[PDB]
Amino acid sequence: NVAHGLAWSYYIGYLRLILPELQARIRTYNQHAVSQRLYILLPLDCGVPDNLSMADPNIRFLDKLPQQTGDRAGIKDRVYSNSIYELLENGQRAGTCVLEYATPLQTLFAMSQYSQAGFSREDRLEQAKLFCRTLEDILADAPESQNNCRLIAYQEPADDSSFSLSQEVLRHLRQE
Amino acid sequence: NVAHGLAWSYYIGYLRLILPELQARIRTYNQHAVSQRLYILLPLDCGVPDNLSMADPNIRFLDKLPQQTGDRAGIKDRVYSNSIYELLENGQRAGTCVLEYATPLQTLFAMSQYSQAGFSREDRLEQAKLFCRTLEDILADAPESQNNCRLIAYQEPADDSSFSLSQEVLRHLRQE
Ligand SMILES: Nc1ncnc2c1ncn2[C@@H]1CO[C@@H]2COP(=O)(O)O[C@H]3[C@@H](F)[C@H](n4cnc5c(N)ncnc54)O[C@@H]3COP(=O)(O)O[C@@H]12
């Protein structure tokens, strides 16, 4: 259950800090049509690209929100930055949102390939699921998240078939 | 053993990324007398101040290294920033170094106060120790760390006595 600690790390060290300030940052970008939620991609195979635009071409980087800074554990002005993306469908802009992967999923992946970490390659999916499950239970009950955060969890068919990440996101964008 | 996953998170998500670039950033500050190692504070009571200068007055913030940026998990130009500190002894500058706490120690602290986290307040010290131990074993064997990183682990007397954080750091600064 290494996923449990990472989910709490993700909430304590990131989400509870940035989400309360997030609407304010989005408002500052819109004035001076981005959606009001942070959308978090949670691929359960724990493949996390660093370049989101390479994962789907229909996902197109737009801009950065205004940075958030804070003094953190001895680091003056530690920077929390977030990227705005446009989602294309048949060459049309179907939506705009703050979009990112959940980074700790890379930690699950890396631990699985490092011998000293003692993490089996086979357990990625299970830990990924536990991570998503733990994170969900945290955010459900979390004050910091009020209708400002959306988890997108998905398992790719993995060469069984075609998959659209942009359609996956657009679904949640539309369900609201 | 939640500490185990955090130590690997700390290495995978931070240290292995920033340490290879660290000498280059310090060289860029010195030209254009900061020590060549990143010094990581590891208080075992898991108290981590956000303002290091408030933990000891003899620790005095100086400046920031040049930022490091990279595309990370869908975030364009995620910023890794580090602070330079001066260490005073009897009103003299005794040293200058890149200094910070290890943030995950705050996650151990926060988990311990959150009911849903299932982490006893009593286990902080043990998890802190396991974190330091795991991190040590990782960095010992880690390519990314070649004489660029130093762990400072300490247990305060906790009202038994006087403690000097700045002297604690100066000791390691001098042992080299
Ligand atoms: N620049 C930094 N300076 C000082 N410390 C740093 C810095 N970067 C990471 N660290 C910590 C040291 O390694 C630990 C694990 O790193 P992680 O990326 O794998 O998971 C993180 C990550 F997912 C997420 N997160 C936190 N901040 C951001 C962010 N700005 N942008 C997007 N995501 C973020 O929250 C998690 C935990 O956050 P931390 O508690 O701070 O511990 C970190």
From Swiss-Prot, chains A, B:
Sequence positions bearing Phosphoserine: 81
Protein name, as recorded: Stimulator of interferon genes protein
Positions of modified residues (Phosphothreonine): 69
Family membership noted in the UniProt record: Belongs to the STING family.
Topology, Cytoplasmic side: 1-176
Effect ascribed to mutating residue 100 to A: Strong decrease in c-di-GMP and cGAMP-binding
Superkingdom: Eukaryota
Chain spans, region Cyclic dinucleotide-binding domain (CBD): 1-176
